Enzyme design. Structure first.
Site, PDB file in Angstrom:
ATOM      1  N   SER A   1      77.027  44.062  48.944  1.00 44.80           N
ATOM      2  CA  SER A   1      77.941  43.207  49.690  1.00 44.80           C
ATOM      3  C   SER A   1      77.773  41.754  49.262  1.00 44.80           C
ATOM      4  CB  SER A   1      77.706  43.346  51.192  1.00 44.80           C
ATOM      5  OG  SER A   1      78.918  43.158  51.905  1.00 44.80           O
TER       6      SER A   1
ATOM      7  N   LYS B   1      86.496  43.206  50.328  1.00 34.75           N
ATOM      8  CA  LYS B   1      85.737  43.009  51.555  1.00 34.75           C
ATOM      9  C   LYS B   1      86.486  42.029  52.443  1.00 34.75           C
ATOM     10  CE  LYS B   1      81.373  41.030  53.246  1.00 34.75           C
ATOM     11  NZ  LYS B   1      79.964  40.739  52.853  1.00 34.75           N
TER      12      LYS B   1
ATOM     13  N   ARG C   1      76.568  47.727  41.415  1.00 29.74           N
ATOM     14  CA  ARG C   1      75.753  46.795  40.637  1.00 29.74           C
ATOM     15  C   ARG C   1      75.691  47.137  39.147  1.00 29.74           C
ATOM     16  NH1 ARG C   1      72.075  43.777  43.482  1.00 29.74           N
ATOM     17  NH2 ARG C   1      71.286  43.223  41.394  1.00 29.74           N
TER      18      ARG C   1
ATOM     19  N   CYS D   1      96.370  55.903  48.098  1.00 33.44           N
ATOM     20  CA  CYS D   1      94.999  56.156  47.681  1.00 33.44           C
ATOM     21  C   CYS D   1      93.953  55.741  48.705  1.00 33.44           C
ATOM     22  CB  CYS D   1      94.711  55.432  46.358  1.00 33.44           C
ATOM     23  SG  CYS D   1      94.525  53.648  46.542  1.00 33.44           S
TER      24      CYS D   1
ATOM     25  N   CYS E   1      99.716  48.253  44.872  1.00 25.59           N
ATOM     26  CA  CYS E   1      98.291  48.488  45.077  1.00 25.59           C
ATOM     27  C   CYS E   1      97.530  48.208  43.788  1.00 25.59           C
ATOM     28  CB  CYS E   1      98.055  49.929  45.533  1.00 25.59           C
ATOM     29  SG  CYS E   1      96.305  50.450  45.622  1.00 25.59           S
TER      30      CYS E   1
ATOM     31  N   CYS F   1      95.584  51.893  42.623  1.00 25.96           N
ATOM     32  CA  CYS F   1      96.307  53.037  42.088  1.00 25.96           C
ATOM     33  C   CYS F   1      97.695  52.702  41.561  1.00 25.96           C
ATOM     34  CB  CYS F   1      96.439  54.137  43.153  1.00 25.96           C
ATOM     35  SG  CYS F   1      97.727  53.819  44.378  1.00 25.96           S
TER      36      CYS F   1
HETATM   37  C1  FAD Z   1      68.155  48.366  51.192  1.00 22.82           C
HETATM   38  C2  FAD Z   1      68.632  47.047  50.631  1.00 22.82           C
HETATM   39  C3  FAD Z   1      69.942  46.647  50.830  1.00 22.82           C
HETATM   40  C4  FAD Z   1      70.396  45.434  50.324  1.00 22.82           C
HETATM   41  N1  FAD Z   1      71.681  45.054  50.535  1.00 22.82           N
HETATM   42  C5  FAD Z   1      72.135  43.871  50.054  1.00 22.82           C
HETATM   43  C6  FAD Z   1      73.529  43.418  50.251  1.00 22.82           C
HETATM   44  O1  FAD Z   1      74.350  44.115  50.891  1.00 22.82           O
HETATM   45  N2  FAD Z   1      73.893  42.239  49.733  1.00 22.82           N
HETATM   46  C7  FAD Z   1      73.042  41.457  49.043  1.00 22.82           C
HETATM   47  O2  FAD Z   1      73.453  40.364  48.607  1.00 22.82           O
HETATM   48  N3  FAD Z   1      71.756  41.804  48.813  1.00 22.82           N
HETATM   49  C8  FAD Z   1      71.262  42.974  49.272  1.00 22.82           C
HETATM   50  N4  FAD Z   1      69.932  43.339  49.039  1.00 22.82           N
HETATM   51  C9  FAD Z   1      69.066  42.469  48.250  1.00 22.82           C
HETATM   52  C10 FAD Z   1      69.424  42.710  46.773  1.00 22.82           C
HETATM   53  O3  FAD Z   1      69.297  44.109  46.463  1.00 22.82           O
HETATM   54  C11 FAD Z   1      68.545  41.889  45.831  1.00 22.82           C
HETATM   55  O4  FAD Z   1      68.420  40.563  46.354  1.00 22.82           O
HETATM   56  C12 FAD Z   1      69.091  41.752  44.410  1.00 22.82           C
HETATM   57  O5  FAD Z   1      69.344  43.027  43.807  1.00 22.82           O
HETATM   58  C13 FAD Z   1      68.078  40.970  43.574  1.00 22.82           C
HETATM   59  O6  FAD Z   1      68.524  40.855  42.226  1.00 22.82           O
HETATM   60  P1  FAD Z   1      67.553  40.294  41.076  1.00 22.82           P
HETATM   61  O7  FAD Z   1      68.387  40.068  39.838  1.00 22.82           O
HETATM   62  O8  FAD Z   1      66.669  39.189  41.618  1.00 22.82           O
HETATM   63  O9  FAD Z   1      66.556  41.533  40.797  1.00 22.82           O
HETATM   64  P2  FAD Z   1      67.005  43.018  40.337  1.00 22.82           P
HETATM   65  O10 FAD Z   1      68.491  43.214  40.496  1.00 22.82           O
HETATM   66  O11 FAD Z   1      66.033  43.962  41.003  1.00 22.82           O
HETATM   67  O12 FAD Z   1      66.710  42.993  38.761  1.00 22.82           O
HETATM   68  C14 FAD Z   1      65.399  42.852  38.229  1.00 22.82           C
HETATM   69  C15 FAD Z   1      65.499  43.330  36.788  1.00 22.82           C
HETATM   70  O13 FAD Z   1      64.312  43.060  36.042  1.00 22.82           O
HETATM   71  C16 FAD Z   1      64.139  44.132  35.118  1.00 22.82           C
HETATM   72  N5  FAD Z   1      62.738  44.149  34.645  1.00 22.82           N
HETATM   73  C17 FAD Z   1      61.640  44.425  35.370  1.00 22.82           C
HETATM   74  N6  FAD Z   1      60.524  44.324  34.603  1.00 22.82           N
HETATM   75  C18 FAD Z   1      60.913  43.967  33.363  1.00 22.82           C
HETATM   76  C19 FAD Z   1      60.249  43.690  32.066  1.00 22.82           C
HETATM   77  N7  FAD Z   1      58.903  43.774  31.938  1.00 22.82           N
HETATM   78  N8  FAD Z   1      61.032  43.351  31.016  1.00 22.82           N
HETATM   79  C20 FAD Z   1      62.372  43.265  31.126  1.00 22.82           C
HETATM   80  N9  FAD Z   1      63.040  43.505  32.269  1.00 22.82           N
HETATM   81  C21 FAD Z   1      62.376  43.860  33.398  1.00 22.82           C
HETATM   82  C22 FAD Z   1      64.589  45.373  35.875  1.00 22.82           C
HETATM   83  O14 FAD Z   1      65.003  46.410  34.975  1.00 22.82           O
HETATM   84  C23 FAD Z   1      65.736  44.833  36.718  1.00 22.82           C
HETATM   85  O15 FAD Z   1      67.017  45.031  36.104  1.00 22.82           O
HETATM   86  C24 FAD Z   1      69.464  44.569  49.551  1.00 22.82           C
HETATM   87  C25 FAD Z   1      68.150  44.971  49.339  1.00 22.82           C
HETATM   88  C26 FAD Z   1      67.703  46.183  49.856  1.00 22.82           C
HETATM   89  C27 FAD Z   1      66.286  46.633  49.637  1.00 22.82           C
HETATM   90 CL    CL Z   2      77.428  40.689  54.608  1.00 20.52          CL
HETATM   91 ZN    ZN Z   3      96.662  52.721  46.092  1.00 20.83          ZN
END
Ligand code: FAD
Ligand code: CL
Ligand code: ZN
Ligand code: MB5
Ligand code: MB5
Length: 664
Positions: free
Chosen positions: A80, A106, A142, A598, A611, A614
């Site tokens: 989201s 959304k 994502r 759809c 739409c 679709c």
């Molecule tokens: C249950 C849940 C629901 C959520 N819902 C929401 C929501 O609705 N909206 C929202 O905004 N946020 C939400 N979040 C928070 C959100 O998921 C994170 O804040 C976001 O994905 C963080 O992104 P990032 O790029 O910091 O890390 P990530 O997206 O986790 O990316 C980290 C990257 O680093 C890479 N990596 C790791 N180690 C290495 C290495 N040694 N070398 C190279 N690459 C490496 C991995 O492959 C990964 O791709 C939610 C979190 C949880 C747990």
């Molecule tokens: Cl939200």
């Molecule tokens: Zn449609």
């Protein structure tokens, strides 16, 4: 533009792996460079937001390489997004007509509060988004968002390497000029790792904290934490049997109760599509964005799937985010064989409204590959005590994280990503233009506000999370206190004035309103009271009365002190213009409708007759945005004019803040 199949054919002609076809689109080349100004560890959403914003803020200044372990953009929870995110996308040249081909529409954050001791009773808190001619918010898969940003990065001078892993054992990070030697391999098994000589390292490895964990232990906040367990489900075309009145699938819906809450996010999934075919579809969409192809002349999502040989389907992301002081029965084998599945299905049958709700949905098996029917993650919230040092800084989840609720992870987290991006230009130039000791001192001083901002950011978000959670224990506090205060404190005032130049400065001043004094005052009163009542007990009615009267008294003064003009009664279904609760009110603006063909949710605007998902043509509900209370033709025209194009950068104008006006 005529669609091109460059990557599909290149992959086939060369029999290229997923990482090789992706990396072949890099400006520098498919192999790693010997040297770069910035090396970003991780191509999650924040690694890519960082690289895009750094390049856009000041082009042709920094050579940037992003290193991602996944062979192609991988699955991530966190779907989201909020107006500040869309605004960022639009500022980077991709507006709603193009984003909606990839992502779900959304409209609004909507909440349903289930009474635990009176099963079947519930209240709600309903909000809307914006007209199609104002802005949109998005539900993003994502793997698709990280693909989009990868391709956009490669088209803006950024190299992104998938299937490559930063080796944090042999990597050397230090001050100096280009003192960093970043070791990059294909994995542990790889005896021929490469080295990128570089000046700045950005830890964007998310919750893994792969670099900054070396500089400080992970920090946990006092009190209970949260666990999450979730899965993916069908998305019904006919939403009319959902047990909540006035329910709409294009909101981010929250089902809230004493133990926590359930998210419900409707979004399209491209799972099953080859990566090369997806590269061609995304590239085509960006070419259309560059050319300004009108929405009705742009192929629909399903047509793109046919054109480029993709798989496309509608899914609902549904998950629990609950406190970790919940007591479970010892044996949950009746609800499944995996812990995530067991606790999900156990919690559903604890609330009759959750079971009636879930009975509209069919579980999808292994949407993101084997073992992905169910997900669980425990002890969600944390903070990194150190987020910068000689030669490096951290962004996004690598700085810390709280909870899915109100989506701070992407939308608040991008404040660190975009500020770090802006700061990266002088950081690198300082090191190139001064001797080592003075460069290091100057960079350290420059990053003191970044360090201080991060240090106070996560605790404020953590208090924000607890504030909402404790109010979810009652069907009056939830909507009338917690939701009300988050919307009033956190609504993005003057967002239409933000541009690339002011974005990071505006974003760090937002914090979802969690730094607003009156917000913290009401939050601390509720937490201090409610945390003294054991979770398995109902809140005493006198406690609810007192907290509600306290919140409303603080609210009326804070609302009167705000100078921002807003049709509050049009945006919030249950509140009048002065943000007073109105018991039976049902009037609100209407900005969206469901495609009869759809089921996809659509933005109402007169130039989008078909739409976007679709292609089915609609019959005249597009100019039928409903303004309640009404707007004149002139007022409507004035609204759309303010949101057409962001204003040019004016170094003399002072930034107008998103938060409420301070009292005199
Ligand atoms: C249950 C849940 C629901 C959520 N819902 C929401 C929501 O609705 N909206 C929202 O905004 N946020 C939400 N979040 C928070 C959100 O998921 C994170 O804040 C976001 O994905 C963080 O992104 P990032 O790029 O910091 O890390 P990530 O997206 O986790 O990316 C980290 C990257 O680093 C890479 N990596 C790791 N180690 C290495 C290495 N040694 N070398 C190279 N690459 C490496 C991995 O492959 C990964 O791709 C939610 C979190 C949880 C747990
Ligand atoms: Cl939200
Ligand atoms: Zn449609
Ligand atoms: N404060 C300022 C600036 C800035 C950037 C990022 C953060 Cl987190 C805080 C922050 C940069 C400014 C913005 N203003 C525009 C008109 C005058 C200034 C003053 C600066 C201040 C200190 C407000 C300016 O020129 N740059
Ligand atoms: C400020 C925005 C982004 C916003 N931010 C919210 C946060 C929450 Cl939590 C709930 C609702 C909103 C909204 C709805 C708004 C209210 N504005 C009236 C004039 C233009 C605009 C922009 C938009 C509009 O059309 N709809």
């Amino acid at each position: 533009p005529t669609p091109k199949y460059t990557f599909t054919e290149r992959a086939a002609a060369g029999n290229l792996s997923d990482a090789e076809i992706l990396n072949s689109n890099n400006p520098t080349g498919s192999e790693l460079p010997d040297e770069s100004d910035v090396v970003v560890g991780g191509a999650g959403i924040h690694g890519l937001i960082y690289a895009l914003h750094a390049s856009k803020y000041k082009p042709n200044n920094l050579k940037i390489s992003v290193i991602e372990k996944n062979t192609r953009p991988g699955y991530k929870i966190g779907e989201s997004t909020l107006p500040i995110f869309y605004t960022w996308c639009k500022l980077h040249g991709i507006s709603a007509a193009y984003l909606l081909r990839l992502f779900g529409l959304k409209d609004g954050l909507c909440f349903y509060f289930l009474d635990r001791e009176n099963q079947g009773q519930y209240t709600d808190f309903c909000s809307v988004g914006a007209p199609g001619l104002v802005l949109a918010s998005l539900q993003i898969e994502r793997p698709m968002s990280e693909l989009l940003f990868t391709i956009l990065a490669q088209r803006n001078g950024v190299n992104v390497y998938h299937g490559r892993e930063v080796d944090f054992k042999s990597t050397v990070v230090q001050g100096g000029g280009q003192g960093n030697k970043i070791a990059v391999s294909r994995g542990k098994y790889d005896s021929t790792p490469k080295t990128i000589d570089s000046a700045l390292f950005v830890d964007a490895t998310g919750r893994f904290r792969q670099f900054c964990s070396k500089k400080a232990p992970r920090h946990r906040f006092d009190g209970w934490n949260c666990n999450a367990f979730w899965g993916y489900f069908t998305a019904p075309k006919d939403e009319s049997k959902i047990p909540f009145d006035l329910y709409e699938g294009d909101a981010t819906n929250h089902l809230c109760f004493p133990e926590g809450w359930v998210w419900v996010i409707r979004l399209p999934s491209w799972e099953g599509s080859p990566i090369a075919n997806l590269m061609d579809m995304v590239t085509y969409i960006l070419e259309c964005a560059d050319a300004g192809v009108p929405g009705d002349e742009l192929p629909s999502s399903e047509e793109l799937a046919r054109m480029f040989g993709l798989k496309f389907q509608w899914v609902t992301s549904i998950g629990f985010a609950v406190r970790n002081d919940v007591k479970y029965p010892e044996d949950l084998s009746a609800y499944g064989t995996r812990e995530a599945e067991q606790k999900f299905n156990y919690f559903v049958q604890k609330y009759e409204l959750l079971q009636q709700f879930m009975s509209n949905f069919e579980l999808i098996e292994n949407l993101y590959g084997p073992g992905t029917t169910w997900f669980i993650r425990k002890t969600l919230a944390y903070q990194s005590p150190v987020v910068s040092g000689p030669g490096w800084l951290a962004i996004g989840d690598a700085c810390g994280f709280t909870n899915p609720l109100y989506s701070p992870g992407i939308n608040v987290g991008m404040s660190t990503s975009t500020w770090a991006a802006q700061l990266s230009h002088p950081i690198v130039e300082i090191g190139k233009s001064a001797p080592a000791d003075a460069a290091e001192s100057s960079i350290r001083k420059l990053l003191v506000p970044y360090d201080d901002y991060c240090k106070s950011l996560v605790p404020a978000l953590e208090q924000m999370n607890r504030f909402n959670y404790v109010c979810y224990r009652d069907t009056r506090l939830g909507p009338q206190v917690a939701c009300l205060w988050q919307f009033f404190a956190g609504i993005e005032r003057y967002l239409s004035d933000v541009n690339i130049e002011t974005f990071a400065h505006y974003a760090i001043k937002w914090v979802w309103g969690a730094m607003v004094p009156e917000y913290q005052q009401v939050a601390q009163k509720c937490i201090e009271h409610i945390e003294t009542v054991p979770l398995d007990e109902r809140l005493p009615d006198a406690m609810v009365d007192e907290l509600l009267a306290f919140s409303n008294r603080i609210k009326s003064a804070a609302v009167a002190a705000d100078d921002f003009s807003l049709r509050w009664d049009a945006i919030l279904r249950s509140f009048d213009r002065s943000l007073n609760f109105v018991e039976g009110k049902t009037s609100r603006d209407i900005y969206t409708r469901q495609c009869s063909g759809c089921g996809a949710w659509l933005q109402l605007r007169p130039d989008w007759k078909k739409c976007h998902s679709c292609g089915l043509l609609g019959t005249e509900p597009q100019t039928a945005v409903t303004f309640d209370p009404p707007l004149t033709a002139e007022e409507e025209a004035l609204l759309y004019a303010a949101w057409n194009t962001a204003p040019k950068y004016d170094p003399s104008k002072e930034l107008k803040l998103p938060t409420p006006t301070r009292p005199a």
